[PDB]
């Protein structure tokens, strides 16, 4: 019939995946460790800022609803199933988020909660089109991630950094991501093949071209103009198609979502909204 929930086992990371039960005592941390989202034993779901409570989930939160919980046997739990839900029998309530209008049932599988470095909690419909480093965790919401927008050329020799990690279209023609310890976490394997150009194209395909526009390697992610290329500080490299569907601040259901930008017009992995 449907998806059932499993227990959450990612305490201290920045993301609560779909259909995972966060129980009392468990918490998320923003990638910069400044913010913590904590389900307390008293049934309050709380965000702390360097250890000081600055938000509590209740009826006062815009775009949320509180309804009766009749089931006495329902454990204290917080989980995401497109919308987020807090089951709190101690106060006879289910506190839940009023997300923006759903577009397909597949969103139920793709939508997870992110605790961002700016303290916002955001529900994000997230699809990893390509993951170059499946062994390295995806870490959304980090100010130190490097994001490349579609239409971004990787200039040969330029070192694009995300913390201590880097992505480089090298002199030898290889396209390589290096992790924080200096070792390569991923490479296209295009060294010594005559590579002249590496580009994250407007169609969302990452492509390394040789002489005569010959294709040497590509991510097979063409046809996704809203995708971004992300290099994380932990060495992860991936191409993701993502959109937020709720947040505790900034979000309005009728507003346009957009990523915040650096003073040099480069996007960062933090969602914001406007008209
Ligand atoms: O795998 C990343 C690595 O790829 C290429 O190096 C390969 C080979 O040519 C090297 O000699 C050996 C050891 O030095 O490692 C690889 O198998 C290079 O493009 C290199 O810069 C890159 O880090």
Author numbering: 2 to 276
Publication text:
The LlpA branch occupies a unique position among MMBL-domain proteins, harboring non-eukaryotic representatives and being equipped with the capacity to kill bacterial cells with bacteriocin-like specificity, a property not yet demonstrated for other family members.
Soaks with oligomannoses revealed additional sugar-binding subsites. In the bound disaccharide, the non-reducing mannose is located in the Man-Me binding site while the reducing mannose faces the solvent and does not interact directly with the protein. Although mannose-containing carbohydrates can bind to the IIIC pocket of LlpABW, it remains unclear if these are part of or mimic the natural ligand required for biological activity since bacteriocin activity is not impaired in the presence of excess mannose.
